[PDB]
Amino acid sequence: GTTTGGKGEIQQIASVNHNPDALVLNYDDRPPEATPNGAILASTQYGK
């Protein structure tokens, strides 16, 4: 046995088969949309 010191652990396969990325909604699937801020516009259309 050549192991006077050792060699590091071999990479093994750890796949994703359940849904741990669930509930993660990115800016690409849905982008942000506007809501009011501090500056407000007047009641522009008062009806007839």
Binding site: T4, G5, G6, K7, G8, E9
Partner: protein, 436 residues
């Protein structure tokens, strides 16, 4: 009004501050890093673990890089409140770091006590204490797991991580010497504590796993690490009881660009005692009562800040017979130098002189290379030990140049040098660039 006005108040003095802006504080750009995972793995300790025994462990090359390493001890108290003082630290008598059959560094329990005593600060120094001692006035029979981190060159920053993957052809080992006499656990002063249990020890090593691109780089490319080493030999002091202030001219045998020199005056009977014992609070067992005895410390308070219990009046370093700086008083090396160079507090009896602007830092900042110096000496002038340690009227009420009669017990001189060397790694094998 407000900050808007402050912005308008722009003038000639601002061209050196805000004119032609180069940076802002409110748009920080962070760097993307190499993917890695940290895993802390238990190592196997070769040998029988116990008081007075020597054991060792070989680090299994499970990961690619090594950084921190923590020695875990399971101890039980052999005494009550205040009978211990860093029992985990005095047990870790020494640790030898070996890479490929050759020594890189070796630390001693007394060094760990010095490193703690002058470099880390109240916040983590107390946690360090929490990890090394009983700090809640625990009684005989209490069992506690202690963590003594090692302070080798590769664990004070990831940038100096030890790349085992690049050292493919040989082992890295740690040799541990476990003290035979541990105050408050196996011994109480010179008296053995009957029924004391043997320590259990485990050494935890923290591994880093690298991703494909960087793991390859580490395996194939050569490396040059600029690393720290400790140098140490012990000596003996000449501490008078009366009529004179003794001097010693102690010849130094250090050999690399050195960042600093630190020294202790120890009482080898106990651990960590660098000051005299006295019948004042925290300065001896039973202090303040008729039962007070100034031959034995109230161990849990062994460290103090009262300079009148210290023995060093002044010190100078000479190189090849010439003064390196003009003679300084003992308080300079105890308080002014760590103030200037570290930013913490050094307890009485522990002294440091730096050659470095930032000796607690990793990047070189000024060194004295004792490899090009023949006659390098540390000149030490002692205080006369004429005060009656049992009379607070004098212990807390006398002049600078005298100390307690119990001060003559600080007979061991411990001078440490911290220096640079270079650890080179080529074709799966490592080694130091400079010998001696």
């Amino acid at each position: 009004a407000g900050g808007l006005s402050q912005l308008v108040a722009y003038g000639a003095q601002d061209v050196y501050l805000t004119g032609n802006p180069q940076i802002t504080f409110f748009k920080t750009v962070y760097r993307r890093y190499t993917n890695f995972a940290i895993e802390s793995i238990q190592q196997t300790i070769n040998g029988s673990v116990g008081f007075g025994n020597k054991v060792s462990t070989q680090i299994s090359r499970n990961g690619d890089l090594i950084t921190d390493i923590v020695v875990e001890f399971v101890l039980t108290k052999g005494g009550n409140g205040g009978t211990t003082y860093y029992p985990a630290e005095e047990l870790l008598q020494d640790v030898e770091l070996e890479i490929g059959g050759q020594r890189i560094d070796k630390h001693y329990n007394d060094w760990f006590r010095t490193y703690d005593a002058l470099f880390r600060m109240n916040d983590d120094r107390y946690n360090y204490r929490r990890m090394t001692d009983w700090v809640n006035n625990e009684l005989v029979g209490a069992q506690k797991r202690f963590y003594v981190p090692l302070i080798f060159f590769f664990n004070q920053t990831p940038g100096l991580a030890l790349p085992l993957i690049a050292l493919q052809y040989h082992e890295v080992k740690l040799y541990f010497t476990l003290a035979s006499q541990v105050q408050g656990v196996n011994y109480n002063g010179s008296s053995a504590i009957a029924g004391a249990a043997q320590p259990t020890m485990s050494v935890w090593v923290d591994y880093i796993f690298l991703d494909t691109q960087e793991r390859t780089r580490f395996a194939q490319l050569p490396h040059e690490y600029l690393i720290e080493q400790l140098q140490f030999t012990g000596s003996e002091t000449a501490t008078p009881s009366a009529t004179t202030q003794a001097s010693q001219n102690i010849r130094l045998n250090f050999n690399h660009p050195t960042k600093y020199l630190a020294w202790n005056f120890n009482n080898p009977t106990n651990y960590g005692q660098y000051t005299a014992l006295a019948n004042i609070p925290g300065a001896c067992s039973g202090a303040g009562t008729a039962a007070a005895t100034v031959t034995t410390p109230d161990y849990g308070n062994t460290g103090t800040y009262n300079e009148q219990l210290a023995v060093l009046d002044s010190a100078k370093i000479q190189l090849n017979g010439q003064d390196r700086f003009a003679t300084r008083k003992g308080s300079y090396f105890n308080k002014v130098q760590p103030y200037q160079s570290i930013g913490g507090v050094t307890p009485a009896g522990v002294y440091l002189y730096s050659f470095a602007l930032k000796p607690a830092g990793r990047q070189p900042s000024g060194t004295c290379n004792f490899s090009r110096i023949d006659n390098a000496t540390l000149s030490l002038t002692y205080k006369t030990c004429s005060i009656d340690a049992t009379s607070p009227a004098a212990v807390l009420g006398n002049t600078e140049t005298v100390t307690a009669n119990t001060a003559t017990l600080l007979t061991a001189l411990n001078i440490y040098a911290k220096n640079y060397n270079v650890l080179r790694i080529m074709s799966g094998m490592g080694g130091l660039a400079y010998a001696n």
